[PDB]
Design a protein around this nucleic acid. Structure first.
Ligand SMILES: CC[C@H]1OC(=O)[C@H](C)[C@@H](O[C@H]2C[C@@](C)(OC)[C@@H](O)[C@H](C)O2)[C@H](C)[C@@H](O[C@@H]2O[C@H](C)C[C@H](N(C)C)[C@H]2O)[C@](C)(O)C[C@@H](C)C(=O)[C@H](C)[C@@H](O)[C@]1(C)O
Ligand SMILES: Nc1nc2c(ncn2[C@@H]2O[C@H](COP(=O)(O)OP(=O)(O)CP(=O)(O)O)[C@@H](O)[C@H]2O)c(=O)[nH]1
Lengths: 426, 79, 136, 23
RNA sequence: GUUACGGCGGUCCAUAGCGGCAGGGAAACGCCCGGUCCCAUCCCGAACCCGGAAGCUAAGCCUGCCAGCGCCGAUGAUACUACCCAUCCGGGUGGAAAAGUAGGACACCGCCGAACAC
RNA sequence: AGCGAAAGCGAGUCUGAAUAGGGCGUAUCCACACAAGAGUGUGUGGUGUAGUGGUGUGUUCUGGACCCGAAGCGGAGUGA
RNA sequence: CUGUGGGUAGGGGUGAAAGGCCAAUCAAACUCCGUGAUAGCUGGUUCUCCCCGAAAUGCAUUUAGGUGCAGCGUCGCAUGUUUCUUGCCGGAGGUAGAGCUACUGGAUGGCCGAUGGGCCCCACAGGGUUACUGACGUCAGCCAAACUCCGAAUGCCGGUAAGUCCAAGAGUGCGGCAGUGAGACGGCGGGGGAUAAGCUCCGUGCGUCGAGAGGGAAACAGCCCAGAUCGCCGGCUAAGGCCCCUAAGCGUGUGCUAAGUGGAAAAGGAUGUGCAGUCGCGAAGACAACCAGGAGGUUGGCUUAGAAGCAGCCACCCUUGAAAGAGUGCGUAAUAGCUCACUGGUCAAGUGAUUGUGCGCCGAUAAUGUAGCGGGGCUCAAGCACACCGCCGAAGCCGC
RNA sequence: AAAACACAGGUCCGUGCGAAGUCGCAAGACGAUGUAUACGGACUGACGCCUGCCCGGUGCUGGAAGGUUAAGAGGACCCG
RNA sequence: AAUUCCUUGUCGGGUAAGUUCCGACCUGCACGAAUGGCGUAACGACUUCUCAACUGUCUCAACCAUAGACUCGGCGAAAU
RNA sequence: UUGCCUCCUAAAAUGUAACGGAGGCGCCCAAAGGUUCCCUCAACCUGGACGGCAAUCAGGUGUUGAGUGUAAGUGCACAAGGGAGCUUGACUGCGAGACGGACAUGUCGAGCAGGGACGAAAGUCGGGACUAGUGAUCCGGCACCUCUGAGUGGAAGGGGUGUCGCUCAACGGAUAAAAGGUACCCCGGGGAUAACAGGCUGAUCUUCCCCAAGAGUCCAUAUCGACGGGAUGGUUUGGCACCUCGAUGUCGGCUCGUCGCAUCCUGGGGCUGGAGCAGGUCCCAAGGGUUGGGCUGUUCGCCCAUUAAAGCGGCACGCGAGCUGGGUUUAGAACGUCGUGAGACAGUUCGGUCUCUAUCCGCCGCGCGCGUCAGAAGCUUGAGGAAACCUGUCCCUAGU
């Protein structure tokens, strides 16, 4: 599934824009992705350059400097962030003579490792095609490695043969038609959703979707709220498909909760097809929830990272600033005290702490009171002698006790729109 | 790719050259071997390269002495 | 998963798929077993699939033995290559199964659930197999 | 693969005794 | 010619071996007391070599019994197989294992010379 | 008339201080003995050894070499 | 721009350079000669018949489509059975197989759990709950071309006796002359490949084609039968056939098959055979109909929108054994409506589940046109087994 | 038929004049009946703004003291 | 880019709709200063885009006449 | 990669291929040779000082488990392994009968003078436990020789004997002396050998399936379905190299089509997570239809505006004796890169001859002849075919 050997490793921060701290964040992010692929971090260096080197990416001097530590380490895992062009990969491979990592291929092959569903792996294969097609005839282990694209002068003069099209163009047409078929292959999950798309949505089952940064605890929240058994692991991309479950409220209307695939930053943008499963959930969701762990890295950079893609997709899609609730939960046993500054920067602290604290009453409220609504305040007064007059109200809708201390009093309940519109019949 | 193999020595044509019952002259090579799979027996000698040859004429006879296969020459009485 | 920690020779001839199994042809660990009825290279991929099938069916409880071990390497020369230029490198590990070999064994209280789990393993497997029992 | 499959399977005949040239 | 005999040898070199329980030194075999001598220790009379019979069968060697470990091991059957029949399956005739089972086995044979007998 | 590399010797000769064995020769074959069974030798006695010119045929050598076929190479000339 | 007259000539000329032009030819013009250049290359090589009759392998090769020698053919001589087949006997081997606690390498559990980690007394003194690595290994059952305690079958070497012996037209040696040295497919044993290829590379006193006609596979070098000396308007057969095409047989007996299976395939299912078991069944009433059975604390609790038998949640282990499970099935706000099981009689021979035991089944799929029996047609077999009778059938055998 | 060649313009190099260069074995010729503001060669290619660093490799132009360095009458010694 | 693999690079223009085109950015795999760098009026049967006009290019083809074709008489081949 | 050695492949004799699986070798020896005579090695304690996993020489125990100079095997415990004494058996010179042996290389050396010891008498040795550690011939060196010495004497030179000099490593070794381009190309051949197309395979691809862990709001199978498994089709990339290289024209577009169905619009099905309107899904169905543009040669692909939809494929990726030449694939030129250059590019760019009168089949039309049992004529049935089949908007029905 297009894996790679990591085991030992040493890191380097390219830091071609931003701050040293942000470069360190990116380095640690890619090192965590390396661990996800299976590894063990040793130490990380940093450098400070302007626009990447068009050929060497990291330059001749830094390429040799890193070859030194490469030969010292005697392994092939040296990590360096970024998106490397085919030329840059060629130059770096010629300099190092070993396997160096790039963010795009690392993300892609970790998606391959984590994929378990047919749609997920089809999407990751599409991302593989998208990434590799540029790396054709030019990159390190290329098709035209002095061995491909042979069929040239097949027509000196003319005779009884000849393929026709340009060799490279036909060789690219191979992958082009492959990915054309794969893009045709796009399956409509809307048919799976329709059970709740038109129905329910309109029939009141609102839609709360948990979206956030990877490792943040999206699936953990889903499990805690919905009694589910969804996968929970520290690894990147622990969740592959945006699963969903039920979860009710004091105002009923089971809030179909949905988790997603986390974001980190500067995603490849080629696996937007893979992320469509979660992009569609955000676009069709009426309550977005960000999840932030107690002792999470950085004060707030992951929130900007997720919000960048959120804003991009939602603005391209529709007129929407989908309800976002940046709750701060799972904070107990965070083993940290410098959280008052973040709390004042954004007031919220509702601990569930992987069910250890379980103080999610404030959350269960917000989720809900934000965008819950129905035809509340209906006075279904009824003699209570017919039996039919109590029918369907306490079953479909949800009562709230109200004046209904007995049956011979004012009876009101928050019911669905279809259930009662003039059915009080005094 | 490229295989690092592809080599082999010329087969040395070893083994028994005279089997039990064959009558041999004084000096014929009875066996060719790399060790002493067969050890020399009566009127059989062992050469530099562990070749078993007949020190005396007569019929080859394969036996065992103390758990070691042995090549012997039994004399053939002239009729 | 099931991969030899070391093989004396990485590239080996294809194991011969001839004859009925001479050994491991009877349940010797568990109550029930999956006996093969056709020759096949049962890859470690297939063994893992069948073992997970059985364990997930029998849910919590029970014990599963995997008699065969995929210790025979089978090579695959690199894709889109011409005949020659040496043998391909090992690509998948298999166990040479022959008819009458008991591949898996199961000990579980419920005979119904045991047979169902073994049938699911047989489905994951690439040959005909029957649920044999210890009771002869 | 029908052509080759038929050409091959027509060796399983009474006259050929399960063998033909080129399978 | 007889020995709880000593040597030299054989076995297609364990059916002989290892281990255990009991027994004897007559001549011998040994242990054993010494190093003056031939001789010897990469140091040592431990060993090798040299003189004696003070002492002992405790050991070695040998006798009988143990099937405990190892060793051998069928017959049947099977696997395999030569040839043949057989349109995929198989089958027949001839050979036939390995493993296991029954079991066998605590060795057998030849030459001398010893003590006694003749 | 061979053996050898020749002084050469010659049914012998070369190798070798070494009558030590081998190499190559003494047409072939038969008998007699002496030997040794290491594959048989040694002498002795018998018959006496067969080439060489033509020429046919098949191969072959040097030539065109069974016949056809290049692109090209060289010498001398002919062409603005 | 052009006329006329001139000059530059071939490894040279001329070239505002295209390798362009230099007499319809130019990366070195043309004619003659060397010359019948040379070509491991392609082609061609002409009358006949009789006898024998290959090779496409080994080694070497500036070699790999060539060649030398060997191997194999032929013709002479010499030897003469030395050849080959079969029986027997003496042999060595390490393949198939098997085994591995017999080695070298990959595997279920208790044992020690030793070296160790936390707990450990927190002491480093001392000791165990020690779910832990739990070792070398101890003891119980499993794999290998480069593993072997073992170990065939064949094959091979040799001996012996025969057979074949008016011949295999054998073996061996020496000569004349070769050709071959591109093999193919099929069976078996294997490597490479994906244990694909009509693939590729090997072995095979294996075959056939090559170089082989004749019969059968429809047609179809390599498959099956069978090796054509010639002529017969004779006969028996081989493989294969036998309804008509197309010569007997729309053969005989017993069964199976319902799909045109036969006449293509990996399959889920059982409703065709026979099996062989097995609960209860006996016509001591079984599976069945008509069959009163419908509130036991029966809303049983769980728990509460009701939680009524009944979203759910493990229960209800009980009797004049009446036939009713604190009730699993449709429901139904929840009751209710109306029943599953068992029953109480007539119950008027069998009734279910099982390895499916094994036969024979059914689900499947390219593009000119039936199209996957050769055709017609065949199940009233002309299909499939097991038996049994005939014949038809070749260039085979026999007859002349 | 062009973006190629050429082109006018540039720069470098060579040339002291039967020059350099070229055709010729040679004579001779062209160069040129010319003279360094002329010729031949190389590259660039109107014109405008410009042609930055490098003489390490290789050519060319000068030569720094050495070392290596054939052809000779330097001919010891040695040998027949 | 007559030079860019990534590449249909990104943005703006132009189209209804622009892998082409123009202007910029330029992170130049692999521009570069007389094998000249960049501009450049004029020039070009050069290459590439745009617009006006124009139209059988096309929507979508129709009709007319000539030369054949076709028929008649004469002559009368060819590759294969 | 090429020679040599070892193993497995290798099918229990020998031998046996691959660009099959593994390794070694172009050496070390003056002792690691010869010989005599002695010894056994690993693995744990009664137990040890600094001493541990491991030193010791701790033998105290323990049965041939390590070590072989060096790869691999075959051997070696009897030792071939470990020690010492002496010595130089590379008996060198002469050599047995024998044998291993396409042609070009190996095993014993029994005998002889002369040795080596240990010793003591008997005794053994022609470098090594064995198989690698090497290179023909030619040419020349260098030593010794009782050989020849161009009239004789010597001499030069030659000869013999013993030796030396080749990574002649492409290791049977063309020469003593040698690299590239060709797209300017030419000739001799090849379908022995690639590109296109066909064929076989079907890894890849493509269509499906089989079990069903999961996703589907509770709810495997509305819709999906991983881990695994099985196949179909032969339109992708491939593999093979089987016809074709005395020529099978190569993409895209145009023209013309024709076929399959794996269907982009009718049929009901179910299911629908089908309220309706719309959808999804499979099942059936090939009648007809299934577009016009911008970018690019462009197949494709993106986009534009529409439509019931703008289906997927086969037919030599259908169709160049039907057309086009946009790209591709001659020669010119330039750019980038590589090359000290000729040139090259698996990069870019501009420019670059598309021949043929149709014989046969085929097809579209049209005649002549003869048939249809006398010669004619009008009207004719219809076996059999050919054509056509497309569908859209708006109204009511019903704002039901
Ligand atoms: C006018 C008169 C000429 O017509 C042409 O030029 C056509 C246009 C050529 O095709 C064109 C074809 C073209 C244009 O297409 C690329 C190009 O190849 C050249 C220029 O010639 C031809 C038929 C070429 O053939 C083609 O040769 C190709 C090598 C392969 C093709 N076939 C075997 C596979 C084959 O038919 C070829 C070799 O010249 C034919 C030989 C016999 C000739 O030389 C004859 C005398 C031709 O000159 C001619 C017919 O007289
Ligand atoms: N200690 C701690 N760990 C947390 C908390 N929240 C999440 N995690 C860690 O994150 C892991 C699970 O990540 P998950 O909930 O899947 O995050 P996610 O947002 O779904 C990222 P992805 O979608 O790629 O799986 C757990 O292993 C857990 O340790 C928290 O509040 N405290």
């Amino acid at each position: 599934y297009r894996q790679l050997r990591l085991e030992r490793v040493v890191l380097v921060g390219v830091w071609t824009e931003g701050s040293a701290a942000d470069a360190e964040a990116s380095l640690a992010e890619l090192a965590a992705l390396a661990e996800t692929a299976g590894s063990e971090v040793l130490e990380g260096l940093i450098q400070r350059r302007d626009k990447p080197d068009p050929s060497t990416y990291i330059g001749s001097g830094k390429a040799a400097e890193l070859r030194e530590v490469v030969l010292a380490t005697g392994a092939d895992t040296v990590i360096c962030d970024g998106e490397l062009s085919p030329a840059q990969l060629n130059a770096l491979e010629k300099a190092v003579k070993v396997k160096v990592i790039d963010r795009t291929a690392l993300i892609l092959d970790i998606f391959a490792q984590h994929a378990t569903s047919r749609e997920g792996k089809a999407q990751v294969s599409l991302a593989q095609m998208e990434y590799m097609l540029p790396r054709l005839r030019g990159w390190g282990e290329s098709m035209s490695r002095q061995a491909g694209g042979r069929a040239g002068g097949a027509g000196g003069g003319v005779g009884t043969r000849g393929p026709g099209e340009t060799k490279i163009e036909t060789d690219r047409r191979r992958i082009r038609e492959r990915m054309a078929k794969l893009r045709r292959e796009i399956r409509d999950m809307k048919k799976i959703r329709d059970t709740q798309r038109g129905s329910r949505r309109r029939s009141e089952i609102p839609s709360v979707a948990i979206v956030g940064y990877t490792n943040a605890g999206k699936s953990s929240l889903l499990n805690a709220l919905t009694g589910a058994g969804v996968l929970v692991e520290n690894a990147l991309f622990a969740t592959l498909e945006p699963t969903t479950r039920r979860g009710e409220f004091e105002d009923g209307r089971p809030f179909v909760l949905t988790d997603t695939v986390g974001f980190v930053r500067h995603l490849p943008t080629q696996l937007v097809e893979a992320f469509r499963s979660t992009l569609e959930e955000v676009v069709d969701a009426d309550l977005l929830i960000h999840v932030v762990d107690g002792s999470d890295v950085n004060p707030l950079a992951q929130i900007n990272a997720v919000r960048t893609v959120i804003n991009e997709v939602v603005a391209e899609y529709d007129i929407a600033p989908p309800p976002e609730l940046l709750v701060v939960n799972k904070i107990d046993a965070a083993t940290g005290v410098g959280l008052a500054q973040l709390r004042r920067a954004l007031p919220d602290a509702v601990f569930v702490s992987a069910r250890t604290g379980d103080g999610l009453d404030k959350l269960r409220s917000r989720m809900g009171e934000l965008v819950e609504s129905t035809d509340a305040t209906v006075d279904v007064t009824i003699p209570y002698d017919r039996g039919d007059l109590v029918a369907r109200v306490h079953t479909d809708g949800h009562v709230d006790a109200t004046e209904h201390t007995d049956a011979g009093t004012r009876i009101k309940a928050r019911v669905p729109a279809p259930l009662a519109a003039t059915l009080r019949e005094y | 790719s490229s295989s690092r193999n592809g080599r082999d020595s010329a087969a040395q044509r070893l083994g028994v050259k005279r089997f039990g019952g064959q009558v041999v002259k004084a000096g014929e090579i009875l066996v060719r071997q790399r060790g002493t799979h067969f050890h020399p027996g009566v009127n059989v000698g062992r050469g530099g390269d562990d070749t078993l040859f007949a020190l005396a004429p007569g019929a080859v006879e394969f036996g065992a002495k103390r758990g070691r296969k042995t090549v012997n020459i039994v004399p053939v009485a002239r009729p | 998963m099931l991969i030899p920690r070391k093989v004396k020779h990485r590239k080996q001839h294809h194991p011969e798929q001839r004859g009925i199994a001479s050994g491991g042809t009877s349940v010797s660990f568990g109550d029930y077993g999956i006996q093969a009825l056709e020759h096949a290279y049962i890859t470690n991929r297939q063994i893992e699939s069948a073992r997970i099938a059985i364990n997930r069916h029998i849910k919590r409880g029970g014990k599963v033995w995997i008699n065969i071990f995929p210790d025979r390497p089978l090579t695959k020369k690199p894709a889109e290559t011409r005949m020659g230029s040496g043998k391909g490198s090992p690509e998948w590990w298999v166990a040479n199964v022959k008819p009458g070999r008991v591949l898996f064994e199961l000990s579980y209280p419920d005979e119904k659930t045991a047979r169902d789990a073994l049938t699911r393993a047989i489905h994951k497997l690439p040959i005909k197999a029957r649920i044999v029992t210890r009771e002869e | 693969a029908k052509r080759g499959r038929k050409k091959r399977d027509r060796k399983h005949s009474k006259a050929n005794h399960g063998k033909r040239p080129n399978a």
